[PDB]
Amino acid sequence: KVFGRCELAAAMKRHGLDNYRGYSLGNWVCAAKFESNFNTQATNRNTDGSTDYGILQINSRWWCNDGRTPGSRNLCNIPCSALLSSDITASVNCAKKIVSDGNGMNAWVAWRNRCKGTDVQAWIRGCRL
Ligand SMILES: CC(=O)N[C@@H]1[C@@H](O)[C@H](O)[C@@H](CO)O[C@@H]1O
Ligand SMILES: [Cl-]
Ligand SMILES: [Cl-]
Ligand SMILES: [Cl-]
Ligand SMILES: [Cl-]
Ligand SMILES: [Cl-]
Ligand code: NA
């Protein structure tokens, strides 16, 4: 499923991401846009042989099981396929664990490079939240 911007801001808000660990909603929407283009079906293979899955490109090295990343962890206790669902619950719950893990939203390369220190409120401007 490819979300509209405001559609994803609202879903993310429903699911408890707004100001989660002090990260305003625009931070999450911005990170989704540059990680996945708001496409829940996005998959990308990494040089280390891990894969990034879903709307927030969560990595099979640490966070989910895809049965093809030797010596990896599954710290969100889910099949990586769970993160490709049109329902973002699984992605959001895993994201909450990731942003709680010490480094905050810097775990998302696209967030660090494209959203951090920007006017991220512009990503929720004019949305019914
Ligand atoms: C939270 C999370 O798993 N982030 C991943 C990161 O590990 C990976 O290096 C990057 C590749 O572009 O995609 C995502 O940002
Ligand atoms: Cl957009
Ligand atoms: Cl594996
Ligand atoms: Cl949803
Ligand atoms: Cl933080
Ligand atoms: Cl915001
Ligand atoms: Na894994």
Side-chain angles (χ1 to χ4, degrees), residues 35 46 52 56-59 63 98 107-110:
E35 290 289 357
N46 301 315
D52 317 299
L56 292 164
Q57 288 291 284
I58 288 164
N59 193 328
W63 304 112
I98 299 168
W108 286 276
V109 51

Side-chain angles (χ1 to χ4, degrees), residues 65-70 72:
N65 177 51
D66 58 16
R68 73 154 187 199
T69 312
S72 74

Side-chain angles (χ1 to χ4, degrees), residues 4-33 38 56 88 92 96 105 111 115 118-129:
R5 182 169 59 86
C6 293
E7 179 187 18
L8 182 65
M12 285 186 155
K13 190 194 197 315
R14 178 188 174 287
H15 284 285
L17 282 185
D18 189 22
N19 288 325
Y20 191 87
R21 292 301 251 234
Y23 291 94
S24 61
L25 197 48
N27 280 290
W28 299 104
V29 172
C30 183
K33 177 64 163 162
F38 301 151
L56 292 164
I88 65 174
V92 166
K96 284 176 185 187
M105 279 196 73
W111 177 84
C115 306
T118 71
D119 176 40
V120 289
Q121 187 279 310
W123 288 101
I124 61 157
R125 183 153 315 147
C127 301
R128 258 197 320 291
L129 295 180

Side-chain angles (χ1 to χ4, degrees), residues 22-89:
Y23 291 94
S24 61
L25 197 48
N27 280 290
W28 299 104
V29 172
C30 183
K33 177 64 163 162
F34 300 129
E35 290 289 357
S36 72
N37 221 11
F38 301 151
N39 187 353
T40 66
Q41 293 200 87
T43 63
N44 288 289
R45 201 77 184 265
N46 301 315
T47 52
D48 76 349
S50 71
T51 298
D52 317 299
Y53 296 85
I55 208 125
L56 292 164
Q57 288 291 284
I58 288 164
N59 193 328
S60 68
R61 181 28 175 91
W62 290 115
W63 304 112
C64 63
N65 177 51
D66 58 16
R68 73 154 187 199
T69 312
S72 74
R73 276 68 144 110
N74 176 9
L75 295 171
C76 295
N77 191 222
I78 48 167
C80 300
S81 69
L83 305 167
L84 297 184
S85 179
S86 65
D87 184 322
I88 65 174
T89 293

